[PDB]
Amino acid sequence: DALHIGLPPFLVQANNEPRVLAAPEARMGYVLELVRANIAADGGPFAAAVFERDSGLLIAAGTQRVVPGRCSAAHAEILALSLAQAKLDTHDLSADGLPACELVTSAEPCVMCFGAVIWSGVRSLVCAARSDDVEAIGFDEGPRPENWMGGLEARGITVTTGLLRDAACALLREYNACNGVIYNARC
Amino acid sequence: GHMNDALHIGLPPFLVQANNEPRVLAAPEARMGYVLELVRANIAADGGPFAAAVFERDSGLLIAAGTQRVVPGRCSAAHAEILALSLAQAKLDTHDLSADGLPACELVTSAEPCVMCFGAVIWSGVRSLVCAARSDDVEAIGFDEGPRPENWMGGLEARGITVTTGLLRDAACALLREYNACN
Ligand SMILES: Nc1nc(O)c2[nH]nnc2n1
Numbered sequence: 461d462a463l464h465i466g467l468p469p470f471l472v473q474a475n476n477e478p479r480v481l482a483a484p485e486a487r488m489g490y491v492l493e494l495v496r497a498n499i500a501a502d503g504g505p506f507a508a509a510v511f512e513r514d515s516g517l518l519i520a521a522g523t524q525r526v527v528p529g530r531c532s533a534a535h536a537e538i539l540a541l542s543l544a545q546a547k548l549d550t551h552d553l554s555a556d557g558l559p560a561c562e563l564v565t566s567a568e569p570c571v572m573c574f575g576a577v578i579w580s581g582v583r584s585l586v587c588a589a590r591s592d593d594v595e596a597i598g599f600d601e602g603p604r605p606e607n608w609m610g611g612l613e614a615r616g617i618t619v620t621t622g623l624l625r626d627a628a629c630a631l632l633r634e635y636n637a638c639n640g641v642i643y644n645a646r647c
Numbered sequence: 648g649h650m651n652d653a654l655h656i657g658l659p660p661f662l663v664q665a666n667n668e669p670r671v672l673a674a675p676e677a678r679m680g681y682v683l684e685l686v687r688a689n690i691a692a693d694g695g696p697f698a699a700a701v702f703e704r705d706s707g708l709l710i711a712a713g714t715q716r717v718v719p720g721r722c723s724a725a726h727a728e729i730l731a732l733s734l735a736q737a738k739l740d741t742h743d744l745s746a747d748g749l750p751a752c753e754l755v756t757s758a759e760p761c762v763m764c765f766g767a768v769i770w771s772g773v774r775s776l777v778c779a780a781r782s783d784d785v786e787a788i789g790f791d792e793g794p795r796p797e798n799w800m801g802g803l804e805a806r807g808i809t810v811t812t813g814l815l816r817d818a819a820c821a822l823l824r825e826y827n828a829c830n
């Protein structure tokens with residue numbers, strides 16, 4: 461009777477508490493905490509958050525819930541964008557009288573999320589890990605169009621990538637190190 | 648609807664029914680015909696003119712169905728394909744419809760997928776995509792497919808997703824032209 465993806469407690473918490481982060485690094489810092497927490501709550505090493513671009517108010521956060529949620533569409537970007545839309549009560553994050561919105565993401569978007577970003581109404585995309593980083597640990601980005609960044613820019617969506625990339629990469633390599641069946645107390 | 652503790656996209660009555668009534672449609676045109684019934688039911692339930700369904704490829708057991716619920720669900724990701732693929736996964740208790748021991752799954756869709764849905768198809772585990780209306784047909788009533796890679800069809804086929812296109816296209820267009828005429 462519904463499409464229903466449950467949020468683990470830490471994500472409910474993130475989505476409940478008012479929070480304002482002005483600097484790109486502050487915003488991405490927070491998104492990287494959610495990655496760490498999502499991995500500790502049985503999810504993939506990806507998180508994202510929709511902010512008010514100009515005030516830094518957090519609207520909504522998401523994390524990859526593919527396995528726990530039994531749903532291949534539950535990438536961090538889909539959850540973040542959709543929960544932001546559900547909170548603001550509109551399918552269009554650029555609807556009249558909404559502030560401009562920004563998707564802050566732990567990694568460059570896959571081809572699915574790329575499309576979702578375009579349809580979402582956000583005006584800004586801010587990424588940490590690059591596509592090659594993500595692919596290096598076996599997560600596929602899929603076939604995006606050529607010059608997909610230019611693609612976004614031409615729809616009025618500004619793209620920045622590499623923001624706190626080093627910390628992001630460190631979280632990716634930590635996930636990979638502990639993504640295996642032999643028990644490892646250190647994980 | 649908005650929820651503290653879930654992303655929750657509710658389904659209108661016809662779609663709750665479609666997802667619970669037993670239905671075996673062996674021939675592909677029987678599959679696409681039923682999907683076009685869902686398109687019409689969706690328009691009457693304030694949705695866009697798009698529907699899709701996951702079938703077991705060989706038997707044509709219907710596993711799940713989705714329709715575009717963008718405006719009434721306040722969700723730009725709620726295309727037909729996303730809901731159909733996600734409800735099937737929910738129904739089969741797995742995020743991968745090609746998981747060992749599941750029969751091969753097929754997504755039958757009213758129109759060729761947009762770039763988002765193209766991506767969702769690849770990650771879903773379906774082994775087959777069957778489309779009615781073409782990309783052109785969708786753009787001609789003002790729906791945007793977005794920037795898909797050159798040769799999106801070959802991209803699907805290259806990872807073992809067979810693509811059929813044009814099936815009951817004229818029937819699907821009749822519904823599209825009606826939707827566009829009635830704004
Ligand atoms: N490539 C990729 N893979 C996943 O599993 C994701 N989850 N959130 N962003 C994602 N990106």
Ligand SMILES: Nc1nc(O)c2[nH]nnc2n1
Binds near residue numbers: 698714760761
């Ligand atoms: N382009 C496009 N747009 C929508 O709103 C859809 N819903 N289901 N397939 C869809 N395809």
Ligand SMILES: [Zn+2]
Binds near residue numbers: 535
């Ligand atoms: Zn993605």
Ligand SMILES: [Zn+2]
Binds near residue numbers: 727760762764765
């Ligand atoms: Zn789509």
